[PDB]
């Protein structure tokens, strides 16, 4: 019963704050150019102890053949997909807290569930973008981001499962 609400909320704040922290730092920890870490925006050294704007997607030594550097490198730049996960998750918790009251038996829970799982898809796809463009160790809050996507996925499972539960109550009492 209410276990759906519990797992739902703890998934919301869990994967949400986890995605935020993932945006914060600890996304890639390795030797810099000398070792440092970076979170896809600006790297911070151990001179040592300061930071620098590191998401310089263009670098002044290349060839840039045809839509490879521009399109892909730009896509990885500004971290669009993970921000898409941010907005979509925001719609997740917001629309579930909306599903608290204002009954609307069928549409809302299913909707937020859909945009929520697909939000997870945006998260994983974004991770793919990041690991891709980066071409040695990873940051820990990176694992926090992936784990956030996972817990999100399970939360969506419980979501849709609760939705079809409501369908079972309605069609059940229909006879």
């Amino acid at each position: 019963r209410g276990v759906q609400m519990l797992l739902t909320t703890v998934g919301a704040f869990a994967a949400f704050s986890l995605m935020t922290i993932a945006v914060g730092t600890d996304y890639w920890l390795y030797s810099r150019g000398v070792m440092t870490h970076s979170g896809l925006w600006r790297t911070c050294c151990l001179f040592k102890g300061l930071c620098k704007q590191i998401d310089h997607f263009p670098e002044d030594a290349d060839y840039e053949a045809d839509t490879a550097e521009y399109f892909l490198r730009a896509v990885r730049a500004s971290s669009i997909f993970p921000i898409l996960s941010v907005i979509l998750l925001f719609m997740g918790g917001l629309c579930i807290a909306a599903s608290e009251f204002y009954k609307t038996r069928h549409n809302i829970i299913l909707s937020a569930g859909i945009f929520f799982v697909s939000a997870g898809l945006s998260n994983i796809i974004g991770i793919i973008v990041y690991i891709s463009a980066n071409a040695y160790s990873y940051g820990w809050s990176f694992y926090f981001g992936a784990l956030s996507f996972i817990i999100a996925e399970m939360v969506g499972v419980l979501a849709v499962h609760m939705f079809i539960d409501r369908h079972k109550q309605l069609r059940a009492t229909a006879r």
Partner: peptide, 26 residues
């Protein structure tokens, strides 16, 4: 290894989405 982790990602993802294909639309 990171490849394998992504494979797990697409794994659970595809699985879930397919389940949504199942349970929805009574």
């Amino acid at each position: 290894y990171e490849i394998w982790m992504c494979i797990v990602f697409a794994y659970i993802g595809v699985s879930v989405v397919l389940f949504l294909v199942s349970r929805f639309s009574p």
